[PDB]
Subunit: 101 residues, 2 copies
């Protein structure tokens, strides 16, 4: 609930890249502050994003909700298997993730 | 190479359940000898399979090829994200997996 609120806030007040393909592309280029993955993200994409994120020291938060659920959290009617926060805006998502438990 | 040949042999000469949903169903009921997962299997399904497989001591081999590729290895035109060997038939898949 807290994380989902933080994600929506980042999307509406900051800058968030939506989609697994786009997320990987941005992270590969070293851009981004935080990666959030849906619980049903394809394993290969999951490993790709974690590999590139690791290379640029970008944290990755593994969510439990589905890609369609994550899309809805972002206020979208389409699935989002992964997203990348470029700018957290007024969100506290960065801090929430830091003590993720 | 060898693994793919072994998988096709099991499908053709033995009994293999195709599909992530069916695989989980069978393993959840304690049936099966070996699970093979495609490289792009959804993470949640992957975790579910490994959880139930673990409960009935059923080995799980994580493949690198995609679901559509695995389907083709099985001689099918459709994607197969996971499969369950009920009977290896004439295949040596069990031995190969032991690695």
């Amino acid at each position: 609930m807290d994380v989902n609120k933080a994600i929506r806030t980042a999307v509406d007040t900051g800058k968030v890249i939506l989609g697994s393909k786009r997320t990987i592309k941005f992270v590969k280029h070293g851009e981004g502050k935080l990666v959030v993955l849906a619980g049903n993200i394809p394993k290969d994409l999951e490993e790709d994003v974690k590999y590139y994120a690791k290379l640029s020291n970008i944290p990755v938060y593994q969510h439990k909700i589905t890609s369609l659920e994550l899309g809805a959290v972002c206020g979208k009617p389409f699935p989002v298997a992964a997203l990348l926060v470029l700018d957290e805006g007024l969100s506290n998502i960065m801090e929430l993730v830091e003590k993720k438990e």
